[PDB]
Amino acid sequence: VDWRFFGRTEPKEENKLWFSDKITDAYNMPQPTFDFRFPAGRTSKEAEDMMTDMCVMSAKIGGFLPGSLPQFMEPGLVLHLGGTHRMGFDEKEDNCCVNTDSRV
Amino acid sequence: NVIQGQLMSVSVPVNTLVVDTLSPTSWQASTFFVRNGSNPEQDPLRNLSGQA
Amino acid sequence: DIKYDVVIVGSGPIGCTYARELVGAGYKVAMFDIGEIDSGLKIGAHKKNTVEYQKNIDKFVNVIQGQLMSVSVPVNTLVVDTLSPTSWQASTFFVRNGSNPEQDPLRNLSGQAVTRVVGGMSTHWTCATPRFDREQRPLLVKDDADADDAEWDRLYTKAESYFQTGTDQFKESIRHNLVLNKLTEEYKGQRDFQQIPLAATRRSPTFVEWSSANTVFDLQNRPNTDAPEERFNLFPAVACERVVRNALNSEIESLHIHDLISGDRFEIKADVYVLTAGAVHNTQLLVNSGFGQLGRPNPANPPELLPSLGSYITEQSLVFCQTVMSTELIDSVKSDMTIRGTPGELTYSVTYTPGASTNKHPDWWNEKVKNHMMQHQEDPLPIPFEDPEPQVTTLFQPSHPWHTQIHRDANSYGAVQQSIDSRLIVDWRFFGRTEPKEENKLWFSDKITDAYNMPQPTFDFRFPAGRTSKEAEDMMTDMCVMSAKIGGFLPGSLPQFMEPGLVLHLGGTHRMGFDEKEDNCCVNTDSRVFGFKNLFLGGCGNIPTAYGANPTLTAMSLAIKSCEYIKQNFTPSPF
Amino acid sequence: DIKYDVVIVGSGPIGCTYARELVGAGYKVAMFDIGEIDSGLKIGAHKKNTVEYQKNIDKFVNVIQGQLMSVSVPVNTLVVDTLSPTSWQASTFFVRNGSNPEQDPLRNLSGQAVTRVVGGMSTHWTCATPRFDREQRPLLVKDDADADDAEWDRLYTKAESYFQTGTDQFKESIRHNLVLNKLTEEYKGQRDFQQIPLAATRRSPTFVEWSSANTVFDLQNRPNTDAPEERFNLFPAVACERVVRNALNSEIESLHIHDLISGDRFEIKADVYVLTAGAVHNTQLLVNSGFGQLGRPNPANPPELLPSLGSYITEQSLVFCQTVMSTELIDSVKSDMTIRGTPGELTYSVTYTPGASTNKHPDWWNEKVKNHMMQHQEDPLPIPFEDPEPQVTTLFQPSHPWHTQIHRDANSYGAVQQSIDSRLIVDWRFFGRTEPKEENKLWFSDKITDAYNMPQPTFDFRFPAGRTSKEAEDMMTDMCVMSAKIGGFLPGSLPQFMEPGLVLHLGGTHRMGFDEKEDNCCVNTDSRVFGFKNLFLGGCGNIPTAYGANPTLTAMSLAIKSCEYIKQNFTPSPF
């Protein structure tokens, strides 16, 4: 049995996706670059509590499979990235790019 | 395998693994230069390396 | 000579317990070890007591691996199908490379190993010497817990003296504190945390004299200048092969030995015979001497002599991981500091106020941190470089019936784990207790022989399925829950059960009880083999209970008691 | 005392060469080692000379690894990005875990390591002691090859005596034969194959006394019963830190030592000072004493004193693989047998005709094979279980300028390689010669310090690009071609270059020649430091040529010559 637990990440202004003005990708488009760390208070506390919860819960069903021991996966392997062009009601107040009709 | 085959990494930092068992005749790097489509902008320690 | 008062087989810490007590009481003692002197001029000492190991501690893992020889290796069934067509290629999984064809690979203690050197495993051990609580502890007196308690307290106190056990050697460690203080805060006062009791004496802020067999007894031949009235001879590179029983099985009449240098075989006569060859090798020697039953067990023919020998074996479940210290704990180190500027720059400053009461830490700590931070501005951690390692435990209790060690063992890191600063890394080892079950056995082949031409050991073992297994998995969970309080797992050192028997805490192979039949056992509470006037067994093989704490101190305590019996019942020869 | 005739720094086989010669000639000798006594009661002996290692030989790889401490480890730049979010995580690749920030990871000898124990590396070495042919050999006499030849033959013969070198210890090995005899057939008579010259004496069909420092000199303090007129003291756990130069750089005036047990520092006076701390540590001691240049090299400021010190360093390229013996070679073992029936069945028979001339093998061989095949019908190979290992070489020659070893080292097999019967496995190690080049350097940090608070060693090394590199790759090909004659590669042990400096054959760090300036060198042919009356260096650091054979016998031979000079030029103190 496979166990995947997915945590929630606080949005923080410092966590960014930006694009090089000189390096280009395979389609000759500006190269994407990340500047990301999981936030340090709630997000991180929850992430480690979530690991513990997986350990506690999974033990109810059986022991770990050798070779598939509890671990955090490579950041972003989950492919659930959000907030890169985020929605809110007010561009300035809610620090956002699209409104609730997804209109820029 | 089908999944892995269509996940192309977003941002791969410059590689800094030391390969020091090359044969003496083989061309050997003097620096960790930009190779194999890596992104020199990328801090390897502030990445989403798994993003694809 | 060919005649001694006492002969002791094995120069481990248990054999040395016998030598200490009996040599000191005036007996003419010989000790034989199959292994050789190889710890320096202190015979049987800890091999980690060199300046070079303590300056390069992770290299010691290699010394340990080098003297752990697997007990029973099943026939290998890995398929190598990328040989060149010209290379000779097997048609079957035949017996190769010293493997044991008797061994079921699925009912093994594959991790079990033995150490054949003067001082035994005490030349490499971790030196943890906790006492067992009543729940884990063999009864020495029945129907009187107070008398039982009093006897164990006396014996344990003596054994702690012999081993130089202490709980203070790591008290000025930042990391030790950081860990202990965090954990004790988190358990509602219901789990006490203390320093691991360690058989060791600190000589300096960077050197620890770890104890060993040599601490217990120096293994020098006597008479000597320092002990001119004592009589002791150690004979290394001598395989002890068989004790000779009389017809009544009331006495041992000689010990057959094989000198491995000369090749010659002798017989040695003693008044008293003590076997302290280890939990495996005691059993092997006895079975090669007609005790129990040689060959694959067969219920349709139970042994007449010592029927419980090699049955009811216990080995502990062991779980392990490492962690990387949390950001919050690392920031806590430097909580009392005012920090201005950026490291490496002209304006950077780190200060604290001596003797202040808003401060979380005492001055010794804050000075160490301040000085490290100001003198090593290239270094991003507040922990001094030479900070001693953590040595933390919450001992076995009824509500959490496992032993815990939260510490640092000498470790071999993969290159990527050498990526993480060692100051951040903490090792977690939790040790479970195993119910004794008749079906769990150590037996010896009647046809296959080991490297010393002795009957090949074979295990038939599974962890019991109810309590033992339930607890083992609860213990894994407990490690996961507890470790998360200190930091996340270190990649490459994720939570796992270790190979069965890698823990090397095997017990019960020649177990103790009050009554041979009623308690399914081989030795009595004086460690005397039932029926025999003059044969005694020492070691963890004696321990008949399910225990999770490290067993050696307990084995030593039983040996002290056995030595008292010998002192009460055998007269030494005149000097 | 604080005054001796001779002081020797290092108790390796080279320091012991000095002790043997000088103690025997009546000098009052002190020897210091930073490491401690740890081979048993034979001080500085080979650690593989226990019964237990020779019955469990692959475990010895661990003893070796345990006493190889890396010289220079670059800052680690592996990315660990699977830490838990709570764990403290680096923002940079900072200096961790004793790494050397001076070190370019791409111009290193990462495999280089040192051994700090009494007897040095000779407590673990493989004991191969070939002579160098003229092509590899330093000149001791110029313009007279006959006189040069005669001097080397004398010195090598003496050194072979000291080490107990022999070429006969493996002659009754089936595997040794199988290999050697096949290869010699295949090279048109143009490459001779012989046994590797080994510093060892066989004591039985299953025990070999490997030589070491202890063989050369027993390291016991003198006077003693056996040498009542000799004067020798060994002081372990003493770091030698600096020799003190006079103003003229014509004499050494004292040696600063640091007792690592007590912590105390002393100065020792001698008439003669010999440094035999190894190729790395000789250099370190000299640089910490004002020889050469401390810090990162700078051509705009060449050292006045010993400008070639730490330049022109050589280390050998090493290629390795293992093979699995061919089916044809295995069938050849049993070529003289008539075999009828199937193993394990009533009718099965294996016979040969004693003394017959159609037979490929002699009777000793055919009896061994027949008896193995008939007594072990469960076993599918014709090779006896205890057959000694192969020990084959074709020595360096102009047409193939590399040393070769075709043998068995103690090996740690992956579980899948433990799949293959050890009788089938042969190790191949080919060692190339490296041109000395000024740009190839060993230097010492002016700010970073090692574990003994001595200037941190740093390498700036690449294998030269023309001859050295061409030969190294030709040598790889030669191993591939030659090994295929015996069998295919063992999966997991495919042909490869080993980590630079893992071979531990470093030379030229304090090199010998006739003229300091003309020959870019530090010591003369008496191993005397130019300019200094009373300072001598011993070891492989002296060897100034490109060599592929194992260097120690050559270093020993130079030390014998140096000892002759001391005997000719210094009077021992009266006893």
Ligand SMILES: *Cc1cc2c(cc1C)nc1c(=O)[nH]c(=O)nc-1n2C[C@H](O)[C@H](O)[C@H](O)COP(=O)(O)OP(=O)(O)OC[C@H]1O[C@@H](n2cnc3c(N)ncnc32)[C@H](O)[C@@H]1O
């Ligand atoms: C290996 C090890 C052990 C260890 C440990 C960590 C490691 C890696 N950490 C421990 C700890 O922290 N606390 C503790 O209580 N135990 C720990 N251990 C295990 C401990 O070392 C052993 O429990 C203890 O050493 C056992 O003592 P004992 O004296 O009973 O046995 P021994 O040390 O194995 O010595 C036995 C000797 O007998 C010899 N021998 C064996 N067979 C023969 C024969 N046939 N004839 C003659 N002599 C024989 C051995 O050579 C040996 O030296």
Ligand SMILES: *Cc1cc2c(cc1C)nc1c(=O)[nH]c(=O)nc-1n2C[C@H](O)[C@H](O)[C@H](O)COP(=O)(O)OP(=O)(O)OC[C@H]1O[C@@H](n2cnc3c(N)ncnc32)[C@H](O)[C@@H]1O
């Ligand atoms: C490790 C090894 C080496 C080896 C080999 C295989 C292995 C795994 N196989 C070899 C072989 O088959 N043939 C051969 O010729 N060489 C092989 N070797 C290498 C060989 O062991 C060495 O070349 C030889 O041991 C070098 O001898 P030397 O006497 O010059 O040096 P050493 O053994 O390294 O001993 C040096 C000693 O000096 C001490 N020391 C170091 N620093 C100090 C300071 N500052 N103060 C005081 N003493 C110091 C060391 O502790 C040491 O013991």
